[PDB]
């Protein structure tokens, strides 16, 4: 319902609020990461090509990419990925979180969109030391192997 | 009229101190305070600095008049700074202690960042 707009071209972001069906009808029934033409979504968004991506709902459960259901389903997740960065969670652990589907639907609260279109000598020393150490190792080989051979 | 004799005495120039067991003989007297042992033990060994000394673990044997303890003649007060437990430097006034209150010392601090 409330939308965050942020721009990667410049780096500014703000939030706005829409409450008209025949404006948000074309906002609905879309997945994450598709562009939406803002002409209909607001008369002052002509040319602006938004991209719906991310967003959460009330009760705070985000949507996840790849799950296609207008519902709050529970998933087993891996830490660090989307919707789960459980900090200090014993690496390798998994939790079964609650998530929303990828297609936008009615019960959301905040929807995230973006815009597509606006209307040393040390190091040298290490290299040569490595070379010298290996080329003295091989001489050690040829010294003591033959010393043992001659017996 | 109390005397002071030391045995089990050994030098360690690994930690550069002079470590010994002292066997003070203090008849009549109740017991001799360490602050008072300091200057006597300094003036017998000519340490030039009566602060490198640290004496500890006294008993005052049953029947009285005879007391044991440990003594550690450091040679450099710098060595006694680095090679020493903190508590008895704090005792001799060479460091100070701070008080703890363990709530949020780590637990609710582990939650934010």
């Amino acid at each position: 319902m409330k939308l965050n707009i942020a721009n990667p071209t410049t780096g500014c972001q703000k939030k706005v609020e829409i409450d008209d069906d025949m404006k948000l009808r074309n906002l609905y029934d879309k997945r994450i990461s598709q562009e939406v033409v803002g002409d209909l979504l607001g008369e002052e968004f002509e040319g602006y090509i938004f991209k719906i991506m991310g967003g959460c709902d009330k009760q705070g459960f985000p949507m996840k990419q790849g799950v296609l259901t207008p519902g709050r389903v529970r998933l087993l997740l891996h830490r660090g990925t989307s919707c789960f960065r459980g900090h200090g969670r014993r690496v390798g652990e998994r939790r079964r979180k609650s998530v929303r589907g990828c297609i936008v639907s009615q019960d959301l609260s905040v929807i995230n969109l973006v815009i597509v279109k606006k209307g040393t000598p040390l190091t040298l020393q290490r290299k040569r030391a490595r070379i010298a150490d290996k080329k003295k190792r091989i001489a050690k080989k040829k010294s003591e192997a033959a010393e043992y051979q001659k017996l | 009229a109390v005397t002071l004799r030391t045995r089990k005495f050994m030098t360690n120039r690994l930690l550069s101190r002079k470590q010994f067991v002292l066997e003070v003989i203090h008849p009549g007297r109740a017991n001799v305070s360490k602050a008072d042992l300091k200057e006597r033990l300094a003036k017998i060994y000519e340490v030039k600095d009566s602060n490198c000394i640290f004496v500890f673990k006294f008993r005052t044997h049953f029947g009285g008049g005879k007391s044991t303890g440990f003594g550690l003649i450091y040679d450099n007060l710098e060595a006694a700074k680095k090679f020493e437990p903190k508590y008895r430097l704090i005792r001799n006034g060479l460091a100070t202690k701070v008080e703890k209150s363990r709530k949020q010392i780590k637990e609710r601090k582990n939650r934010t960042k």
């Binding site: - | 360690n12 690994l14 930690l15």
Partner: protein
Amino acid sequence: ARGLKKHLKRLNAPSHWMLDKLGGAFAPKPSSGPHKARECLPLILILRNRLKYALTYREVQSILMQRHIMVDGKVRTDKTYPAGFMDIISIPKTGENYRLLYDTKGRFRLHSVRDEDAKFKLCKVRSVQFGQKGIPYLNTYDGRTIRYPDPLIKANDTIKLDLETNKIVDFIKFDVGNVVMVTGGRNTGRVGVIKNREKHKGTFETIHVEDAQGHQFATRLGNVFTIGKGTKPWVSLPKGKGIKLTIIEEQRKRDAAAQAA
């Protein structure tokens, strides 16, 4: 349980560590190292409990982190290092050398040695076999591996190693009639000359040894250790020349030391 045990309780400690009973709950727990870790002594026991150069865990930590305490030609800062049989422990600041040997009653003494008999150590070999590309190598009970072994050095034998050339200079062939000293069990500590060696198919080989003054005993192979060829040792023996003396005899020594003063 579910992994390696990292604590060792004082009563569970080896009996030759001598360490007391109310001294605490735990013992130094010698780290995994080059020697059998039930036949070893941590350098913390070398420092605090024998030489007394410190008085606490943390003071021994100061000792070792000063980089003074050098073992076997190279400083070892670990405070649970399993130093054991004929490990040589040197201290440059004291210019003082020690070598760790069994004494006759089954425990470990630190026998001082001068620099010439501290430039090298002496150890037995576990087994000699081939490796990659057919290069022979031998394995010692100190863990050391030596490649291109002298074609006569075989298993169970003894070898001297300098700390600069870091290889073999000479070797004692474990055989009948060379002085040994048992390194495990109730006969450990006693030096003596092998007098017989009988083998039974599929079991431990038995070594019958005679001490320098008449007594005779037997031992398993993993416990014996040749020192020198013939009767003469190639190492400085401790104050008891490897003769374990009967309790009556040792009572007489103390009685005589009393009546001599």
